[PDB]
């Protein structure tokens, strides 16, 4: 210890690098934390608290729940491309880890040839830009026309309710950089990107909702952005919506239709709001479902 | 392409450390990756080889098995102990990434107090030793006198079959820079070690394998060494045992008896061949058990 055997080093607390390497045929994919964030899934959820406190004891663990913030980045060889970007500081202290993670993980903005978002929620879409500029200066920044109509709006923007105005003025403020330089590229629902990934449109949860499907060499990674928050809830109960979801039936439709196709498919997703990496299989567990996270691999 | 044009961006492919952080009440944990290594479980579990196939697959594995190697280390306050440290290269070329692992989470060897071993497998004590040298140059190293007598006796190694006189000779050679300076230390059976950790019997896997419970402010982490080597097949039916036990019925009835203790009593476990960093609770689930990994944290 520091002194004798008395008294130990001091503690060092902090976490490893949020970073994880997983090879998916001949890409490399490396799941990117952003950050956790606490979540008030009690009030969150569109049921009674008492049903969420029960599910959550279930798994042990409690509200508020910290909640993972991941992103997606895929190197096909040809190509690196990253699938969503965190929230900078548009979502408090805790997050706007992907940039050092990114670095961590032995690549430099500069070199993300291409960008696909999710939908154009903060945590996704505010790692974008940093000072006024964008924080990858050689990328292409694509997602689904719907979002951009909807979110980049200020029509929108101006009846918003003043507590959800800041949503509109983070899309705007992170994908303007690439806007004006040109370098944003919509696409209309299910679409081939870069040979290997495609755009599969997941609407609900934003009226642009898009999934991105990854594969090489016969693996398939289903990257699922938002059809998920709060794992201990929503495997088991489906059904369950969010107050962050813009339709709640269609965001509901959308999380069975994707949770029953991994079923039946055996292939591996990605979530945003699962526990970091947020990848793993999935397997029907009666009315529900069964998340399997992947094994821990290294090369 | 366009003049200087640059080539596509290499794949990167290192692993992130493997280390994670947890906190334990006042303790501060850290799990700590050796690395992998493929098991030909189909042959090496007791049971036949179709049944273990159908189990892996139902949890989109297939043998051979990618198997983490485990170790904890326990920042008490008042001590720093490391429980298990990994194969160093008596297991092949993938394992023995603890030393790295430990350096990436913030310790050095010399400020380990105490190293608490769960018995003297390769992959367990190989971390003790480089180039004839006690690697933990303070520390004090504690095990089962069981196993102790066991492992560390020349009768022993000389009537073992010769494919398995190697964990002998490894046990041996890791312990020797203890055992000479005086600074290894056996307990027999259950024993109190450090205000917050005991020594918890559970042989037979090894004649004198042990647990070790860790607790602080209510808050209690049972670390089960090798009470476990295969999750996907093991957590259904905790009956099966493998080749790797001295003892397999033993090693059976220490099994269910640390899962349903855990069901019971709601505590975490750890545990050096579950998918790193192999933490988390067990909830009973018809006549098996349910593994529930930790949520992901970061202080
Ligand atoms: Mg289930
Ligand atoms: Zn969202
Ligand atoms: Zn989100
Ligand atoms: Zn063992
Ligand atoms: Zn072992």
Not at 83 to 92: I, N, P, Q, W
Not at 214 to 221: A, D, R, T
Not at 241 to 257: L, P
């Amino acid at each position: 210890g520091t002194i004798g055997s008395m008294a130990a080093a001091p503690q060092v607390k902090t976490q490893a690098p949020g970073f994880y390497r997983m090879m998916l045929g001949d890409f490399e994919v490396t799941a990117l934390s952003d950050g956790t964030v606490d979540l008030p899934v009690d009030k969150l959820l569109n049921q009674p608290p008492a049903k969420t406190q029960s599910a959550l004891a279930k798994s042990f663990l409690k509200a508020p729940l910290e909640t993972s913030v991941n992103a997606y980045l895929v190197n096909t060889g040809s190509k690196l491309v990253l699938v969503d970007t965190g929230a900078a500081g548009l979502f408090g202290p805790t997050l706007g880890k992907l940039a050092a993670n990114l670095k961590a993980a032995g690549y430099q903005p500069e070199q993300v040839d291409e960008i696909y978002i999710t939908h154009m929620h903060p945590d996704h879409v505010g790692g974008l830009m940093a000072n006024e500029q964008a924080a990858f200066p050689n990328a292409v920044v694509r997602a689904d026309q719907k979002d951009a109509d909807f979110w980049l709006s200020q029509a929108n923007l101006d009846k918003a309710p003043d507590d959800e105005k800041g949503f509109f003025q983070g899309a705007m403020a992170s994908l303007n950089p690439y806007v004006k330089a040109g370098k944003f590229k919509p696409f209309s629902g299910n679409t081939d990107l870069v040979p290997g990934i495609k755009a599969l449109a997941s609407h609900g949860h934003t009226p642009g909702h898009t999934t991105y499907v990854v594969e090489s060499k016969g693996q398939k990674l289903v990257l699922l952005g938002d059809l998920i928050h709060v794992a201990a809830v929503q495997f088991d109960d489906p059904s369950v919506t969010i107050q962050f979801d813009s339709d709640s039936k269609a965001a509901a439709a959308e999380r069975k239709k994707a949770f029953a196709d991994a079923a039946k498919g055996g292939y591996l997703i990605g979530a945003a709001h699962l526990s970091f990496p947020g990848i793993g299989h999935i397997r029907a567990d009666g009315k529900g479902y069964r998340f399997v996270p992947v094994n821990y691999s290294v090369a």
